[PDB]
Amino acid sequence: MLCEIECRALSTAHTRLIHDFEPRDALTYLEGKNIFTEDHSELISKMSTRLERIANFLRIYRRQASELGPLIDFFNYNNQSHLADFLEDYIDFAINEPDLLRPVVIAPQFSRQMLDRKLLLGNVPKQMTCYIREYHVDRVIKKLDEMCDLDSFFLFLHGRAGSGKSVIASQALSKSDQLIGINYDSIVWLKDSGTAPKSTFDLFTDILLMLKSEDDLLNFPSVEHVTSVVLKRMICNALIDRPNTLFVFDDVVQEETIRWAQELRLRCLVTTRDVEISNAASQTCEFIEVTSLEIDECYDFLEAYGMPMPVGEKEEDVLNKTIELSSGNPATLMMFFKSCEPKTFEKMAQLNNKLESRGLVGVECITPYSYKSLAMALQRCVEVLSDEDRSALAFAVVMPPGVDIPVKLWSCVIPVLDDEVADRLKRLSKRGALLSGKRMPVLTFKIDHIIHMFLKHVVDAQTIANGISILEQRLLEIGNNNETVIRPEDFPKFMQLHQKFYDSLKNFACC
């Protein structure tokens, strides 16, 4: 048999192999050097058209010979040397050159191949354009490049809800030209979002079909009822036709997805909110955390979508209010613009008010987000939660937001040496990025504002006042024992420092 180069030669030189050639001239010469057989030669010798003798000569020849020699040593003698010169030149440009073309470009306008055809067919969403988070999309593309050699791997692009992960994935597979074509052959992008137990199988059913040819989508059976071992075997079956295939698993909630992904030895980008699902995988698990949009990236984000930059001091202050409230969050920021109507700083501050005295419902809008409001998103994140963590979280309302505060100061409100509070608050930041850990000076946590104002108009109006009282109580009991700076332990006794917001919270729970 030949190989890719020698078949590239027999295929490339066909425009040529039609104008001047005839297999009969070679049939005897090939029945001779022992690379044909008199039935092979029979098959090629009694053929009506020359295109017949040629197509059978090029098909039939490739099985018997160990190489493409006795066809160069033939066009020479037959005065058809203009062919054998091309082929000897080519064999020289491959035997004699250990460098050719690699997977790169020689048929340009990959603008419609990779950009148009494969992304669209692999269901990759239409990348965002008016703003790109440089750092992250870049680190994604890089860290994906480092791994295309590997047979299977997980990349966890994890963050808060609406933190912007999927969009970054949209851009990382739509920006470069390397990831699809050079580093990976095909793309399959599937939204998971599975909560039910039948979802993790249905997903991989639509994987199995993401694989299947344009042909035999018609033949689709009532495949809904067939074992898991068979769907899996059927994929890794249908996975032969798919050399280096990248898998985006947009929105994973269940670690069962990840277990299937890991049984099927797949290469996965994974957008998710809960980070701990990776413990399901024993493997090169690699991570990229989608942090909150810095105040400045938020500025950039504002400018990018035609938003006027401040002048007076209490306007830049108004906008640091907005960036602070929506604690660096892509989705609610976008909803915010979409809802900023006149565009004025005035109606912008209007919204800044609307957000504290009406919660997230004050800025809910039609947005590129699947969700009317981020509360609709966090909803699920709170449903998935361990019942006890659902509790701890439910109480973390009564803290001060955008303030770093000690564990003992937390042992007071969180249910159950009370480090267990810390364990819950860790799980709580790991699983939807609901909290915020900060190791030293002292093991302290912090609740952001969006993740707070979620809980405000959402936790039981009573449980608020109860947490306020249970805190002022144990604060008093610690009473009894007797900026870039943490609150000292000589001074926990007066939470009155955060009285302003404690007074607001109070007016809420009791009215």
Binding site: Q379, V382, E383, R390, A394, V458, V459, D460, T463
Partner: peptide
């Protein structure tokens, strides 16, 4: 608590 979560 959690008004329908």
């Amino acid at each position: 608590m959690f008004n329908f979560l």
